[PDB]
């Protein structure tokens, strides 16, 4: 089914039509808290807000608002937190969320500067000896080490809660070559990165939900989570071919608006899942073939 559908849609040049139908059929729920006048400076884009029903709340009497949503894929048995790229005044709120939700990993799919414009604050330290202290939420964040590859970087960060005196290791999975409104260089380089996240244990149910972000926390981020989710379903279902990508994406859109921003991201998502299915079907060797193909040197 899935692979035949990709064919017919490509044959038809109907990607745009298919993607527009998704847009038209997506959920609409209220975002009243996001829209409160006091939260204007907590929102990067006017047109990207969390639904009230799925918003992550900060453990704060002051103002519990962050632009972040919990995507809870019931059949897949995986949750993700999708958030915007934090603003200069929200970096503290970001790491407070990571802390309160017990996340292990943060997946960043954007750069801080894209096409000449600041898309995301510099929310993590670039140098070991220049740790960050978030005064408002009483957190400290230290770069321990990093592993730079050709198209992504993995960082080991230590997050300390200054109130409770506890520390946690956070893994930062940063895809540094995925353009805004664009797609990865290939399914293999995408999968190699996704499988690296998976193998780190950051997506395990013993931790809180991964935080996945881009600039808005919907386009690239949507692409990443939809692939992962579909590949999970492929592995759980009696029939691996029953996975309907369009349905899985409308399901995710119940939780955060606007996931997958272009038709070509939608198409890439299908490519990824189709290729990724070789692993799921049992051929655990193809991981090594993605690694080599991705040119991570």
């Amino acid at each position: 089914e899935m692979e035949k559908e990709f064919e017919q849609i490509d044959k038809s040049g109907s990607w745009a039509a298919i993607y527009q139908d998704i847009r038209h059929e997506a959920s609409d729920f209220p975002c009243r808290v996001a829209k409160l006048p006091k939260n204007k400076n907590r929102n990067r884009y006017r047109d990207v807000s969390p639904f009230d029903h799925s918003r992550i709340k900060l453990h704060q009497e002051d103002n519990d608002y962050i632009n972040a949503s919990l995507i809870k894929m019931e059949e897949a048995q995986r949750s993700y937190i999708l958030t915007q790229g934090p603003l200069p005044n929200t970096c503290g709120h970001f790491w407070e969320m990571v802390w309160e939700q017990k996340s292990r990993g943060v997946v960043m799919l954007n750069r801080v500067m894209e096409k000449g414009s600041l898309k995301c604050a510099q929310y993590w330290p670039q140098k070991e000896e220049k740790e960050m202290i978030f005064e408002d939420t009483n957190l400290k964040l230290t770069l321990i080490s990093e592993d730079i590859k050709s198209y992504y970087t993995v960082r080991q960060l230590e997050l300390e809660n200054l109130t409770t005196q506890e520390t946690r290791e956070i893994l930062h999975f940063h895809y540094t070559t995925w353009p805004d409104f664009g797609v990865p260089e290939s399914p293999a380089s995408f999968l190699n990165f996704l499988f690296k996240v998976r193998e780190s244990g950051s997506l395990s149910p013993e931790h809180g939900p991964v935080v996945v972000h881009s600039s808005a926390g919907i386009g690239r981020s949507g692409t990443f989570c939809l692939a992962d989710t579909c590949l999970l379903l492929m592995d759980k279902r009696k029939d691996p071919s029953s996975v309907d990508i369009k349905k899985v994406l409308l399901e995710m859109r119940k939780f955060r608006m606007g996931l997958i921003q272009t038709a070509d991201q939608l198409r890439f998502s299908y490519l990824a899942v189709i290729e990724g299915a070789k692993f799921i079907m049992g051929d655990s060797s193809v991981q090594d073939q993605w690694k080599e193909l991705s040119h991570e040197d």
């Binding site: 990067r44 884009y45 006017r46 047109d47 808005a216 919907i218 606007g258």
Partner: peptide
């Protein structure tokens, strides 16, 4: 404000 889609 800025708009992500556009």
């Amino acid at each position: 404000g800025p708009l992500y889609d556009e």
